């Protein structure tokens, strides 16, 4: 942003109308644009002035009838009265010109064509007037759009500034939702801008529609109401279809959310699914959900494709009905009237296509005003401003009675508190005694009923949650204060921030998120102190600053700072630890809001009150490859050819109906002699044609065929795009579910989950719609060009230059338009971050009285975000104006070609050409608009296809070595021979030359340090990752010769963390349903789970949600071993099945495990040496090596044994607390 004066304020009517300044800016840009090249916001569009005017208007409106019936709609209307009135007048002029020009000019031109005499001057005046009227209406529309954009930008800025100002002084911060508050100051502005723009554009339909209806009634006669009746019977049907599509999308949203939740659940425990060979059940469930979503999308597309393209269909149907009824009754019809009616119907269709978005914008505006009025009535916070009697006393309250606000909730009664400067006063009490009430009252969040409160100076506030600012260590600590070296060093040393600086390589400039992603509770508390220290206020308020901090560091910080730096300033201490008040100056005890005992520490101890009791208690651009891939996935070139053929068939049927109407008009009497009086002669009248019924039947059949073909084409296109989407879904699901988990380890599941969700929702919502719209617009434009060129072969000599000019305009425009959109979102991220940070820390800003700098920053960000948006809208309007001018030139060329050849062609062909030339308006702009949004989805298609050909292939399901034996394993004997294991390439080896033998029916407990390789035994035993060396023999058969499906079918592993898939209890035990009821009941009663299951009325049909947070933890674990029992595997491995659980529950679990699998081998991967006692043998791993291999009886009898040393260390750690 670097400019002196905005070019808009220094532009004339023609310059602003044609947007010459932005054209010059684009020509300057034409390879990229930065923020240093764009202009800043204009002075007239500044947020400060608009916000002040809006606030003044709101204040004036409030003091009119009272703050109970004031509507912000009246305030908005008053604010934008002049601009909206000017916009309405300009749109009236535009609609009047657009109704007077084409219809009258076409009627005059076709009437002159039928005349026998030819004039080379009268037609030139008509075409010149038509061109002038079209230019005038286009320029007026451009001016209206520019004024509406300016008004909307100003209104959005003013309303956002007012909303931010009101929020900064909110009393009940937690009353409103966190998301709603952000959405109010982020999304509502765009809604208001769009609503104002399209509401100013609204007054273009009801006027021109009535004018056209009156013109048709005057021209045709009593039969002119047929088109009106057709429109009234058709457009509400389209509205009902749109409502039905929205209703179907409502359930589609829930279906997509369910599919997303299922995919997230599958990806969260992908390791467990692979280790349990339960892929098929989840795949079938996902397929069923996908087919349900496919049916919902099929219904939505069937109910949506009807309204995609309906204006030409409505025009043709209305023309068919009107002309058939008028001509069949015996009246007379001419080409001029018919084509004038066709053009007027086109005008009504354009108006009634523009109108629905205006209605939607009006509804959105009403919703936005209601929401804003809901927030603007919230209570405001107040600040204490009265001064004490003497400067010596800083805090003074006399029998003050204060109550909470939500109604008044009294909590403090008869409060007599007096604190002098330099005195440290502490607050003691329990939860709900009123310790937090006093903190809230001293800030100013409580109302006063009796007495008075004296407050002098400001306060330094520290939050319990330690709210942080979206900045670095240097910025947030200063908090806008001046930077000095010695003070900063002393503050850093006082709070012991040196370890924090040493840990972070760039702690001086380390960025911190809204809440803190790389910080702990103690570090956040310490930073809070540092910031508060720098603030250096007269009064210090500490609301539990050493709660999460450790005792030693907290005491050190207290002694170094509070007992030294704050010896001459008032300090208020509120904490749950009463041991810090021994050296404090004064002690105050809070109990039920009433003061009972207060004074010094020794006096409090001598009084033997409740304080003594509690004290002694605590003491103890995409390439064509993406398009080709999409075409191939759609069903090959055959589907594309079929779709194109159906679209061309529909468009050609419409064009053939129009051409047959023109042919019928041109036919006339067909050289038939009729009697009109005393003499007989040929009369040119269409009512004398004896083939009336033939033409009428052909016309009706053509209309019906066009409708049927349109419906068939829509259905086929929807089916094809949904089949392509389903094919892509199945292919992507198969690729991910079969790829090795190394991809999951390298790339987090969040990335693929977000890709799935966003890409699939976006494609299934937009891509068929945009593709259908673009194809229809392109084919309609091509047919319109061809039909005009068909009648006049010389039409191409002007199309060519116009074609290259349009291509040049598109080339230049495609760079600037796509660049300004990126710059709009560049500053949006700081805007949203600043909005989020302010709301999360409103209390801290209110306490620090920093509501002005934040407001100024918000205004600056709002201006820096509004300027690129305004520039982008102006560029869009300039492109639309250029396209409209191109279409105007095309229409002028068509009319000029029509004029020169008058008398050589039938008037019907000229009328057809002039009618098809008029429809070309808007089509070019629509084609250009849809050529940029379709590509935005093809990049998502390319991103989806990227993982399709990138994922590798895991081991085959069936190994050519075949199954070893039908009863394998024959026993439970395992052997190791130089086991080599590594997680990834270039990583250090986990297992290096480890060999051991495990006898049948042995209990093995593996215990070792972190990183030794204890967790790697399970990965290598299951052939999760191919070994880099050595061989493993089980029952005399090498493991590597057995397929993955067969190997995992006879081995059991207990997960470290209980896992419960969403669904049914039976589905969580055996989804494939291979076991019988009696076996399941016996397994349940083995772990004493029969009582907890049969009690529910849905024992086998109980609903289990995510993570199974409906039973107890012990119940979940017991269900886990019960599930592990079903597979009946001779080899079992246990890995840390206990985590922060009661004692008797673990005892019961251990005894159940011991009794249930007494005949199965044990490989216990546990870190607790107490639980591994009594096992047959103990395994110790030392950085991937084995040193001790014997029974624990002789291991504990040797002092030099490492296992004995570890057991002694564990015993010492348990015994010493201390």
């Amino acid at each position: 942003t670097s400019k002196h004066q905005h070019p808009v304020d220094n532009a004339g009517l023609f310059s602003c109308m044609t947007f010459s300044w932005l054209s010059s800016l684009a020509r300057v840009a034409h390879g990229e644009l930065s923020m240093e090249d764009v202009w800043s916001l204009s002075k007239h569009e500044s947020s400060d002035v608009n916000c002040r005017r809006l606030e003044r208007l709101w204040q004036e409106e409030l003091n009119e009838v009272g703050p109970d019936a004031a509507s912000l709609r009246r305030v908005v209307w008053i604010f934008c009265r002049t601009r909206l009135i000017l916009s309405i007048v300009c749109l009236m002029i535009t609609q009047l010109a657009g109704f007077s020009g084409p219809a009258f000019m076409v009627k005059h031109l076709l009437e002159y064509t039928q005349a026998t005499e030819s004039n080379l001057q009268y037609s030139l005046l008509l075409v010149l007037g038509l061109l002038l009227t079209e230019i005038v209406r286009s320029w007026s529309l451009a001016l209206t759009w520019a004024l509406n954009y300016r008004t909307g930008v100003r209104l959005r800025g003013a309303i956002l500034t007012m909303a931010f100002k009101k929020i900064l002084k909110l009393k009940n911060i937690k009353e409103k939702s966190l998301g709603e508050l952000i959405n109010i100051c982020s999304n509502d502005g765009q809604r208001m801008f769009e609503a104002a723009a399209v509401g100013s554009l609204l007054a273009g339909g009801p006027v021109v529609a009535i004018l056209g209806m009156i013109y048709n009634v005057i021209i045709l006669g009593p039969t002119g109401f047929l088109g009106s009746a057709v429109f009234i019977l058709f457009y509400p049907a389209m509205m009902f279809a749109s409502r039905l599509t929205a209703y179907f999308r409502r359930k589609c949203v829930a279906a997509t959310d369910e599919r997303v939740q299922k995919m997230n659940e599958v990806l969260t425990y992908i390791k467990f699914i692979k280790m349990y060979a339960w892929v098929k059940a989840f795949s079938q469930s996902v397929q069923k959900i996908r087919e349900e979503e496919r049916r919902i999308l099929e219904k939505a597309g069937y109910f949506q494709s009807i309204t995609v393209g309906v204006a030409p269909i409505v025009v043709v149907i209305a023309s068919v009905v009107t002309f058939s009824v008028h001509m069949t009754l015996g009246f007379d019809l001419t080409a001029a009237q018919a084509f004038t009616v066709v053009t007027v119907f086109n005008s009504m269709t354009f108006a009634l296509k523009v109108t629905p978005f205006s209605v939607k914008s009006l509804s959105e505006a009403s919703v936005a005003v209601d929401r804003f009025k809901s927030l603007f009535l919230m209570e405001e916070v107040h600040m204490i401003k009265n001064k004490p009697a003497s400067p010596h006393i800083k805090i003074e309250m006399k029998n003050a009675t204060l109550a909470w606000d939500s109604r008044l909730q009294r909590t403090l009664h008869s409060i007599d508190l007096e604190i002098q400067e330099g005195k440290l006063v502490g607050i003691c009490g329990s939860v709900g005694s009123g310790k937090t009430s006093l903190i809230s009252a001293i800030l100013g969040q409580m109302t006063l009923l009796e007495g008075s409160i004296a407050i002098s100076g400001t306060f330094a506030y520290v939050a319990q949650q330690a709210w942080i600012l979206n900045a670095t260590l240097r910025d947030n600590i200063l908090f806008g204060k001046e930077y000095d070296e010695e003070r900063y060093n002393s503050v850093l040393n006082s709070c012991c921030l040196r370890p924090d600086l040493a840990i972070l390589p760039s702690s001086d400039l380390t960025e911190i998120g809204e809440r803190g992603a790389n910080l702990s509770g103690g570090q956040r508390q310490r930073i809070s102190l540092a910031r508060a220290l720098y603030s250096d206020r007269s009064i210090y308020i500490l609301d539990d600053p050493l709660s999460a901090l450790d005792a030693h560091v907290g005491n050190h910080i207290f002694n170094s700072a509070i007992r030294k730096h704050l010896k001459s300033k008032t300090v208020l201490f509120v904490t749950h630890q009463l041991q810090y008040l021994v050296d404090c100056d004064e002690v105050i005890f809070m109990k039920e809001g009433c003061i009972t005992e207060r004074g010094t520490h020794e006096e409090l101890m001598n009084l033997n009150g409740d304080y003594a009791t509690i004290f002694n208690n605590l003491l103890l651009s995409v390439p064509w490859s993406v398009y080709g891939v999409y075409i191939q996935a759609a069903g090959g070139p055959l589907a594309f050819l079929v779709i194109m053929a159906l679209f061309m068939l529909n468009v050609g049927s419409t064009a053939f109906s129009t051409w047959w109407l023109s042919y019928w008009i041109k036919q006339g009497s067909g050289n038939t002699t009729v009697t009109r009086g005393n003499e007989t002669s040929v009369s040119d009248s269409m009512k004398d044609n004896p083939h009336m019924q033939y033409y009428a039947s052909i016309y009706a059949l053509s209309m019906a065929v066009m409708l049927i073909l349109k419906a068939i084409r829509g259905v086929v296109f929807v089916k094809g795009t949904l089949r392509a989407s389903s094919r892509l879904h199945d292919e992507l699901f198969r690729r991910i579910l079969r790829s090795p988990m190394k991809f999951f380890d390298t790339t987090p599941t969040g990335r693929i989950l977000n890709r799935f969700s966003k890409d699939m929702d976006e494609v299934d919502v937009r891509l068929p719609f945009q593709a259908e719209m673009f194809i229809q617009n392109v084919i309609l434009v091509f047919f319109c060009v061809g039909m005009i060129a068909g009648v006049f072969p010389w039409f191409l000599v002007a199309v060519g230059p116009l074609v290259i000019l349009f291509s040049v305009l598109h080339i230049v425009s495609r760079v600037l338009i796509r660049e300004l959109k990126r710059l709009d979102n560049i500053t949006q991220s700081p805007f949203l971050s600043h909005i989020t940070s302010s709301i999360q820390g409103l209390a801290t800003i209110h306490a620090y009285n920093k509501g002005q700098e934040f407001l100024h920053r918000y205004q600056e960000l709002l201006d820096d975000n509004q300027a690129p948006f305004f520039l982008f809208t102006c560029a869009m309007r300039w492109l639309a104006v250029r396209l409209d001018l191109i279409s105007i030139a095309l229409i002028t060329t068509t009319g000029l070609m029509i004029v020169l050849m008058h008398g050589q062609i039938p008037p019907a062909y000229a009328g057809l050409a002039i009618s098809y030339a008029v429809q070309l308006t808007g089509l070019f702009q629509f084609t250009v608009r849809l050529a940029s949004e379709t590509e935005a989805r093809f990049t998502s298609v390319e991103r989806i296809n990227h993982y399709i050909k990138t994922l590798s292939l895991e081991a085959p399901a069936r190994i050519k070595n075949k199954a070893p034996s039908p009863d394998w394993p024959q026993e439970g004997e395992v052997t190791f021979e130089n086991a080599e294991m590594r997680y990834r390439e270039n990583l250090p080896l986990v297992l290096k030359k480890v060999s051991f033998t495990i006898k049948p029916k042995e209990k093995i407990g593996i215990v070792g340090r972190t990183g030794s390789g204890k967790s790697s035994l399970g990965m290598a035993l299951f052939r999760l990752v191919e070994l880099s060396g050595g061989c493993i023999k089980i029952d005399g058969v090498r493991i590597s010769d057995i397929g993955l499906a067969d190997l995992r079918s006879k081995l059991s592993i207990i997960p470290q963390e209980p896992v419960l898939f969403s669904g049914t209890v039976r589905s969580n035990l055996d989804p494939f349903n291979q076991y019988t009821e009696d076996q399941i009941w016996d397994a349940l009663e083995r772990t004493h789970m029969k009582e907890c299951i049969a009690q529910l009325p849905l024992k086998l049909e109980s609903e289990v949600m995510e993570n199974g947070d409906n039973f107890s933890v012990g119940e979940r674990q017991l269900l886990c071993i019960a599930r592990a029992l079903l597979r009946h595997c001779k080899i079992l491995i246990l890995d840390e099945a206990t985590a922060a659980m009661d004692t008797e529950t673990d005892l019961l679990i251990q005894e159940t495990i011991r009794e249930a699998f007494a005949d199965c081998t044990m490989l216990t991967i546990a870190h607790r040496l107490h639980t591994v006692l009594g096992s047959d043998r103990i395994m110790v791993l030392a950085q991937g090596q084995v040193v001790e291999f014997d029974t624990p009886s002789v291991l504990l009898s040797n002092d030099s044994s490492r296992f004995y040393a570890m057991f002694a260390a564990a015993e010492n750690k348990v015994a010493v607390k201390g």
């Binding site: 759009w145 954009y149 952000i182 982020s186 999308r249 309204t307 995609v308 296509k353 978005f357 849809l930």
Partner: peptide, 24 residues
């Protein structure tokens, strides 16, 4: 919400994006 009767009229210079604001 996004039917042809709405997006076609806003294709005259209005962005085809309502909110896209939901966050974590």
């Amino acid at each position: 919400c996004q039917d042809a009767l709405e997006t076609a009229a806003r294709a005259e210079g209005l962005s085809l994006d309502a909110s896209m604001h939901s966050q974590l």
